[model samples]
Target: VPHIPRGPVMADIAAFRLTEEEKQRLLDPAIGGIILFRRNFQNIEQLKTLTAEIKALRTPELIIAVDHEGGRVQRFIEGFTRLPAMNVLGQIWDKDGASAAETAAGQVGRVLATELSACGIDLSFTPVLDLDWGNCAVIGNRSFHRNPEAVARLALALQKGLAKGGMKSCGKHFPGHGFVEGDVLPEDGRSLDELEAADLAPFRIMSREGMAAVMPAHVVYPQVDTKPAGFSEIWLKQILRRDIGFKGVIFSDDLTGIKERARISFEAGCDIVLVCNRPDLVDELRDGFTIPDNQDLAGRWQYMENSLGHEAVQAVMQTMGFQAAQAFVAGLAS
Candidate 1:
């Protein structure tokens, strides 16, 4: 099992459940996990059956994850709870203070994690670490707050909730992506010396707290490197690993049509490469790639693979936290 080639491929599907061809494609060791969008879902019953089928496909089971960070980014929404934007928690912090905000964040996290896991989803790329600068539309309210300290506090609380629910959390857009407006190639990278505390503080704290995973922004910082963080050894290997001391799984953003970028992502230290929304390209790339089952990478990958059972979801949802969580998430959206 340890020696088998489970290439760091994470892909998306085009249906409610696996197609015969999709089933065969997933069996390729070059591919690793599944990422679902709104299209992959119909209802909880269907999603559960679909996920059960996906998990059954291989030994130790392939990772089944989603981008259900809630607000505008939630993928499967029909039967799922409508979770609020993270800024809602930040607004609470503005009036109610940090303690109340963190409590709400944790409850929100628990509900988000449990509901998804209840239906057999393993992970959610959540707790966006980027600060809302009031300038970047891409990051605006999805960010918890502009204050780095507040963002770290809220994200950690959410991480606690996710862990309690037996789901792993991946802090995203590493180094920072909030200040910039659009996805530019990392034409200009940054050196740590050039970065301010406000920029790196939240991620540094999240890393110190032992975040289970991180996804680097494609944005370049020339002070650090010439390529995007996903493609830069300086950012992922030297900085993220050596300087930040993160030992968790590293996931690349969805690189759908990019040839050889997956290999570059892996070489740069991302253990999981997301190739979403394009199944045909997934097949084309699979035949050209071979994954090495490096023992070192698998050791950390196991944490991202830890998933909750249905009983845990039921037990947690039966608590007072969930009732408050439901109200918190619902009221924020409206």
Candidate 2:
């Protein structure tokens, strides 16, 4: 084989654009992509420039992504469409049924994809898959509904909308997170059978449709494994991959330590691991650490390059679909 670059990493930078110091970091063997936070953005024009500059760095370029899920989690809020929480969709379902719920979800998703793609964001870690069981505060409003069926439909509708806008969707904290009383990032004795049919409902329901990616929670289930979901083979390999037949990318939670965690996550079957928040981890990941790339893996994450561009994105802002989604979300405020 030729000299394949050693990288499957999805990390972050420190500002609106790559600093001279950070550009050297991108040349590291472990950098496959980048995750953006609020600090990395200034305005839409700046965001466009930032994302373009980041992509221009490499031949294939890095995966440029953000947490533009709307609500509190939305990283880039200024001059961007303000989307309501997912729970608002659930409420719409209760009042107006599936049709209304899906319409709103799709509209919101379209706006999210179109605008973000225009600004050059590849993917947005979105559509929280956890059911709103009223247990975890972190997952409360983020979830669509306590009913797995509702959550599944809404997630699918949203992803389909994402495709329309030239972006892809990712369902997060898979197998479930709302059932637990702790943070999404979890162990013990939750029966595997109950776990499978109950908490893991949304993913199983939509597994065949296939999300573009998934983010496993750090929470653990001792009955299944002692390790957290991000580091567990049973969850990542067996359940998510083999059982569900989901062939997309698996984005492991956050980055703290270096090689040890990376080895553990990949060994357990994560296609890509996230190295975010900490810029210094690149130092530790270089040299001794090099993430291997593959043909299929490229196809899996290749959507990162898909976008609607500046002109088309501006056009979408004036569409009826955008107006409807905006009006609906705004109405919920009162």
Candidate 3:
């Protein structure tokens, strides 16, 4: 196996022409992936061309991702379908029951995956597994359901839809993020211990369904561990990996976000550190950082590169009935 470098991966640099400085930074051996934003997207053709250029700069392959979870969080909406927030699906579940909700959830995932794959995107951080608390503004409508079981079942269906559409899914903000009453970016974030078993339920359930990746929450759990979930080896290596049996990659939330800093958080346990909309940080990671090249780390990158592609993703989206769902979602938005 080839030597695999560790930590400080770049994500979602803007789609503009890379400055001479930015271009040089991207070519740095340490940079592993690129994340996309609404700003980077103009249309399918332009986005695909941009992705191709970024890939051209790397050898092992660069993971291209977006936060296309449907609803309000979706970054690109003009050429793509406008998806309903996950909570709307939860409301449907409450009104019509689980079978109906699961179907809708699957459709949502399928449509999102298909459209994104068509444009050459590899993955979307989706199916927000956060159990809705109704109070947490950040995660309220973004969550699929409040019931852990329902959230898990729906999330699995969503994942299946993504798989059908030829794209993989990343179950996000794990253990949970719904307990947060306010944004963690501006204040000293609170702990997760106040959250009950119900909050942790969705992630526990979905991990069994072969989830491809996970992104940790920025909030700390004082009772469980001193560090935020992203930085807690007890949480990532021992809990999420060892106990839950998640073999896939663990990506950190945008390091640029207020809840946590990227450098310290990556040192904690995250395999891939995401720095959204911050090319300066990307430069810093590439120029100043010195990460050990290890087998385990290399294997994670290899897995991500192989798992992400166009054809496999397309097949999954089609199977999940993405086209029809896309039409439905668009109608809702209008």
User: Model-by-model lDDT, in order?
Assistant: 0.80, 0.79, 0.72
Q: Output the number of the lDDT-best candidate.
A: 1
In Å, residue 29's CA in model 2 sits off its true spot by: 3.2
Candidate 1, residues 1-334, lDDT tens digits: the string is 2334345788878889899988888888887678888888899999999998887787657778888776888877776679888898999999999999998888888778888888888888887998886756777778999888899999999999887777878888887887777624534344576455676888888888878888888787877677877878888888889988888888886786456777777778888888887787788888867674557666665677656668867787788867677777777677
Give the per-residue Cα lDDT of candidate 1 at 64.
Answer: 81
User: So what's the TM-score on candidate 1?
Assistant: 0.93
Q: In candidate 3, which residue ranges exceed 4 Å CA deviation?
A: 1-8, 17-20, 183-196, 257-263, 305-322, 332-334
Compared with the true structure, what per-residue lDDT tens digits does model 3 show for residues 1-334? 2333434475556554455666566666677777788888787778878877766665655667888987789988777778888888888889999998888777777777777777767778887988786767877688888788888888998888787566677887877877667544312244444443577667777777777788988777777777778878888888888877887778886766222365566656677777777776666656656664444666665554434357765564565454567777676555
* 1 against 2, candidate with superior TM-score: 1
TM-scores of all predicted structures = 0.93, 0.92, 0.87
Weakest lDDT window of 10 consecutive positions for candidate 3:
185-194
In order of TM-score, best first, we have 1, 2, 3
Task: Give the number of colliding residue pairs in candidate 3.
Answer: 12
Worst 10 residues of 2 by lDDT: 1-10
Best by TM-score: 1
- Model 1 clash count equals 12
